[PDB]
Structures are given as C-alpha cells and as structure tokens.
Swiss-Prot record:
GO CC annotation: host cell cytoplasm
Protein family membership: Belongs to the glycosyl hydrolase 24 family.
Protein's name according to its UniProt entry: Endolysin
Catalysed reactions listed for this entry: Hydrolysis of (1->4)-beta-linkages between N-acetylmuramic acid and N-acetyl-D-glucosamine residues in a peptidoglycan and between N-acetyl-D-glucosamine residues in chitodextrins
Annotated phenotype, changing residue 30 to A: Almost complete loss of enzymatic activity
HAMAP family assigned: ENDOLYSIN_T4
Expression induction or repression: Expressed late in the viral replication.
EC number, UniProt record: 3.2.1.17
A single GO molecular function term of this UniProt record: lysozyme activity
Gene: E
pH-dependent activity: Optimum pH is 7.3.
C-alpha cells in the first residue's frame, strides 16, 4: 500500500463537483476548490485549475493529474514547515504516510497546530499520541477516517487499511 492508494480510499473519486464533509465545493480525489458558497465561484476555480471549460465535470485523467499535484504540494509543504519537518524526519515509512494524510486533508497550518501530539510522535510515545490526537474536532467530525489515520500512527502498519 502506498500514500496514493491510502488517500484514494479515504477521499474516494468523483468526476462531478460535489460538497465535502464540511460543505465545501470539491472535485476528483478530495481536491478542495473553494470555501465559497457559490457554485459559480466553484466552476470558475475549476476552469483555472484544469485549463479548460469544464462546466463542473472532469475526466479520470484530469482527476489524477490534480491528485498528483496535491500529494507533491503536501509533501513539499511538510519539508518546508519548521514545525512539520522535524517530525516527518523522525518518522518511519508508514507513519510518514499518516502525517501526509492529515496534511492533505487539513492543511499545514492545521496539523502544525497539534503541538502536543506532534511532540509525542517525535518522542515515539505511540499510545499517548493516539490518545491525544482523538481529542480534536477532526476526530469528532470524521471519526472513521480519523481512526484509520490514528491506528497507522499507533501501530506503524497498514492494518486499518487492509
Ligand atoms: Cl475533544
Ligand atoms: Cl469518517
């Protein structure tokens, strides 16, 4: 299993504009378009993004190309963040996937906010971190996806995804 197959399971694929769990305008593999209420402000973002007139609908390829971009962006933002970088560096290969997962979903600023959890992950206190991570809006809103991610950090295996 790898980072792409993991996110594809957590986010799903959709070829038509839709609203995310928070109510935002999204498309493809969890690509957020706009936090704006307007379907028009969404269609326009979408055309800029693809380089064509989409009229709210894209192909598989287009969907995957956006996904490639977003994963890369997520990885580079982690390596550029003074708070994230060190954590990532301290982690093994699986766990590293788990942090990329939170970052793709919640943004760098967001995860950079889990000060305590970050500190415990760095210290390799797995069980403690799993417990602290659950005390968050994140976990309360998307509990099953949170659980999957959290098990990945606790265990270091891909069990929750198999
Ligand atoms: Cl809480
Ligand atoms: Cl969920």
């Amino acid at each position: 299993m790898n980072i792409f197959e993991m996110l594809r399971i957590d986010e799903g694929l959709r070829l038509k504009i839709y609203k995310d769990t928070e109510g935002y305008y999204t498309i493809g593999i969890g690509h957020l378009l706009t936090k704006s209420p307007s379907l028009n402000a969404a269609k326009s973002e979408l055309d800029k993004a693809i380089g064509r007139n989409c009229n709210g609908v894209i192909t598989k390829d287009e969907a995957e190309k956006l996904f490639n971009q977003d994963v890369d962006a997520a990885v580079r933002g982690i390596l550029r963040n003074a708070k994230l970088k060190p954590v990532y560096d301290s982690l093994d290969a699986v766990r590293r996937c788990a942090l990329i997962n939170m970052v793709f979903q919640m943004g760098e600023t967001g995860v950079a906010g889990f000060t305590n959890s970050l500190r415990m992950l760095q210290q390799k206190r797995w069980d403690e971190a799993a417990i602290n991570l659950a005390k968050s809006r994140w976990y309360n809103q998307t509990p099953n996806r949170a659980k999957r991610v959290i098990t990945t950090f606790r265990t270091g295996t891909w069990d929750a995804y198999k």
